[PDB]
Design a protein around this motif. Structure first.
Motif, short mmCIF file in Angstrom:
data_model
loop_
_atom_site.label_atom_id
_atom_site.label_comp_id
_atom_site.label_asym_id
_atom_site.label_seq_id
_atom_site.Cartn_x
_atom_site.Cartn_y
_atom_site.Cartn_z
N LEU A 128 45.89 45.75 37.62
CA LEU A 128 45.16 45.76 36.36
C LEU A 128 43.82 45.06 36.50
CD1 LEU A 128 47.44 44.78 33.31
CD2 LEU A 128 46.54 47.05 33.81
N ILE A 129 43.86 43.80 36.91
CA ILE A 129 42.67 42.96 36.97
C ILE A 129 42.73 42.17 38.26
CG2 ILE A 129 41.65 40.86 35.96
CD1 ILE A 129 42.18 42.07 33.21
N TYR A 130 41.57 41.94 38.87
CA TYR A 130 41.48 41.10 40.05
C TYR A 130 40.31 40.13 39.91
CZ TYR A 130 37.91 44.52 41.48
OH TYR A 130 36.80 45.34 41.53
N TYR A 131 40.35 39.06 40.70
CA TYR A 131 39.35 37.99 40.62
C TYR A 131 39.15 37.55 39.17
CZ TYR A 131 35.51 35.11 42.33
OH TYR A 131 34.72 34.05 42.68
N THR A 132 40.28 37.27 38.50
CA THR A 132 40.37 36.68 37.16
C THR A 132 40.04 37.68 36.06
OG1 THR A 132 39.81 34.46 37.97
CG2 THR A 132 39.61 34.84 35.61
N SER A 133 38.96 38.44 36.22
CA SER A 133 38.38 39.16 35.09
C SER A 133 37.83 40.54 35.42
CB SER A 133 37.27 38.31 34.47
OG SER A 133 36.31 38.01 35.46
N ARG A 134 37.94 41.00 36.66
CA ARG A 134 37.41 42.30 37.05
C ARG A 134 38.46 43.39 36.82
NH1 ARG A 134 34.42 42.19 42.76
NH2 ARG A 134 33.74 44.19 41.86
N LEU A 135 38.09 44.43 36.08
CA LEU A 135 39.03 45.50 35.78
C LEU A 135 39.08 46.49 36.93
CD1 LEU A 135 38.79 44.33 32.86
CD2 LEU A 135 39.05 46.68 32.07
N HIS A 136 40.30 46.81 37.38
CA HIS A 136 40.49 47.89 38.34
C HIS A 136 40.04 49.21 37.73
CE1 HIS A 136 41.92 49.82 41.89
NE2 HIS A 136 42.93 50.43 41.31
N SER A 137 39.72 50.17 38.59
CA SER A 137 39.23 51.46 38.11
C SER A 137 40.28 52.13 37.23
CB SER A 137 38.86 52.36 39.29
OG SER A 137 39.99 52.61 40.10
N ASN A 150 39.58 31.13 40.99
CA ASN A 150 39.46 32.42 40.31
C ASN A 150 40.05 33.58 41.10
OD1 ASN A 150 36.82 30.90 39.02
ND2 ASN A 150 37.91 32.25 37.61
N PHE A 151 40.71 33.32 42.23
CA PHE A 151 41.31 34.40 43.03
C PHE A 151 42.69 34.72 42.45
CE2 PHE A 151 38.02 32.90 45.87
CZ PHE A 151 37.58 34.06 46.48
N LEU A 152 42.67 35.34 41.28
CA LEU A 152 43.86 35.58 40.48
C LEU A 152 43.86 37.04 40.03
CD1 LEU A 152 45.22 35.62 37.38
CD2 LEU A 152 46.38 34.37 39.23
N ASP A 153 44.96 37.75 40.29
CA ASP A 153 45.10 39.16 39.96
C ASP A 153 46.25 39.36 38.98
OD1 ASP A 153 43.32 39.36 42.16
OD2 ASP A 153 45.03 39.68 43.52
N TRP A 154 46.19 40.46 38.22
CA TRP A 154 47.26 40.85 37.31
C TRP A 154 47.73 42.25 37.66
CZ3 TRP A 154 49.47 37.39 34.02
CH2 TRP A 154 48.72 36.26 33.67
#
Length: 225
Positions: free
Chosen positions: A165-174, A149-153
């Motif tokens: 945009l997103i880090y750790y698969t599903s966490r939204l950046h501020s 799950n250590f995947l960023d967009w």
């Protein structure tokens, strides 16, 4: 606020060297890790290496160990990328980026310095797509091995701006709107934009931040028609 102000473009002859600079403001580079990322036509986004400015400790992708030297000066809050004996292959945009957890994610990016000379594999699908306002699109990526799950967009706008945009698969950046969501596990991950807006025209890149060295996918160019 956080800034990474990169030096102006370099136009040089083969065999010359250059030293790119990035002056931070709104924070002290001593308090983070500073990375450099190459965007060339031939290989896409490639992490070059990084420095911990507090102690000067560097790490590099072995592919660049003879090409690149990264330094930093805490007093002037400036980081540097020295590139030696340049060739046509070194013609690229060089991004200076910060990440306080090393390469787990890259939360802020400079605008990129153009240089003109006169291991986990990430794959993304589709490579390009055209959609309409209000549409829903899903972009996927596949890692050659399990990245836990250590995947960023990242979203790269046409003007060169890159944002997390997103880090750790599903966490939204501020500051990232609700329309963006991420999903997946193991080797297979996806980014969904639920109601497309005109501002979403961009190239989307994935990155694994699990396994040295961090590696990027090839990008998905999203257009609106």
């Amino acid at each position: 606020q956080v800034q990474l102000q990169q030096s102006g473009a370099e136009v040089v002859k083969p065999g010359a060297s250059v030293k790119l600079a990035c002056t931070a403001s709104g924070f002290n580079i001593k308090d983070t890790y500073i990375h450099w990322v190459k965007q060339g036509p031939e290989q896409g986004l490639e992490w070059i290496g990084r420095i911990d400015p507090a102690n000067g400790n560097t790490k590099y992708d072995s592919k660049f160990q003879d090409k690149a030297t990264i330094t930093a000066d805490t007093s002037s809050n400036t980081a540097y990328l020295h590139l030696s004996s340049l060739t046509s292959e070194d013609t690229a945009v060089y991004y200076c980026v910060r990440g306080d957890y090393d390469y787990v994610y890259f939360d802020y990016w400079g605008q990129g310095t153009t240089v003109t000379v006169s291991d986990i594999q990430m794959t993304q699908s589709p490579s390009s797509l055209s959609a309409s306002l209000g549409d829903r699109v899903t972009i996927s990526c596949r890692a050659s091995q399990d990245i836990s799950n250590f995947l960023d967009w990242y979203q790269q706008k046409p003007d060169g701006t890159v944002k997390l945009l997103i880090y750790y698969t599903s966490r939204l950046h501020s500051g990232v709107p609700s329309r963006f969501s991420g999903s997946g596990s193991g080797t297979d991950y996806s980014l969904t934009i639920s109601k497309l807006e005109q501002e979403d025209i961009a190239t989307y890149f994935c990155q694994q931040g699990n396994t040295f060295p961090p590696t990027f996918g090839g990008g998905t160019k999203l257009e609106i028609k």
